[PDB]
């Protein structure tokens, strides 16, 4: 649903990221492949080493997307509908994976912004990432 405070908190914290967004993005990706190995099946062609530019590069691609969605918050099913077709109809990604990427995305934001990561914020980013996932799996429900 995202009450007002929610979308308010989200902005501030995601604002506190800025240029780091790209870096945090790749960190998140890396944390996932490592903790939940099963997820690597979707990126066969990839080089998954530590420095890997594909990951470093795809890390920014995802970061920017979240940024854009933070922007057009009051309207995500439109701003993301391009990715829905890709993730849902073309790639057919198991819904459960979206849960794993959200967890790691939070683990990262709480290791670089311990000043921002409060129970109140923590709770908002979860609701937010929650929505964004629904949107991407849209053509499953």
């Amino acid at each position: 649903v995202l009450s007002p405070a929610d979308k308010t908190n989200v902005k501030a914290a995601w604002g506190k990221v800025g240029a780091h967004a790209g870096e945090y993005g790749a960190e998140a990706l890396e944390r996932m492949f490592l903790s939940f190995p099963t997820t690597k099946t979707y990126f066969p062609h990839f080089d998954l080493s530590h420095g890997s530019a594909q990951v470093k590069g795809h890390g920014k691609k995802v970061a920017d997307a979240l940024t854009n969605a933070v922007a057009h918050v009051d309207d995500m099913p439109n701003a993301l509908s391009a990715l829905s077709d890709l993730h849902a109809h073309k790639l057919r990604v198991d819904p459960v994976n979206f849960k794993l990427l959200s967890h790691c995305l939070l683990v990262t934001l709480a290791a670089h912004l311990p000043a921002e990561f409060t129970p109140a914020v923590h709770a908002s980013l979860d609701k937010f990432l929650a929505s964004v996932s629904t949107v991407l799996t849209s053509k499953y429900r």
Binding site: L34, V107, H122
Partner: protein, 146 residues
Amino acid sequence: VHLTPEEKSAVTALWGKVNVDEVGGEALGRLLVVYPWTQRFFESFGDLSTPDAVMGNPKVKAHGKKVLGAFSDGLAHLDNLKGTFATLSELHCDKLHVDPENFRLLGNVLVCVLAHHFGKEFTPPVQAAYQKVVAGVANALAHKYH
């Protein structure tokens, strides 16, 4: 349960620098804030209306100290993990009637808390290790049912 040499030690490595009187209460607290339906189980603790009310509850943080005790414990008995929690299993299972999915939840928020204090010391290889511990700890408690 799978921890390889470095993991085995790495996990224990951090665990020593863990402020025992903080983390326990902070993890039990965030759980109640982020996943509201879990409050149903702790009526007796009192006021849990505002996130501050939760974080500022003596009983909450006093009980949280007992939860980390259970981890420190099973963290020292990785071999027979599926037997150290035998009683807590029977307890949370047919005494309290907690759906197991909920064990997974508390496991993850603990991770968030550890990563919160150890800032940059909490590396991916570390997170990956701790994720396995947490998993076994949860898998154990649900064993009573299945």
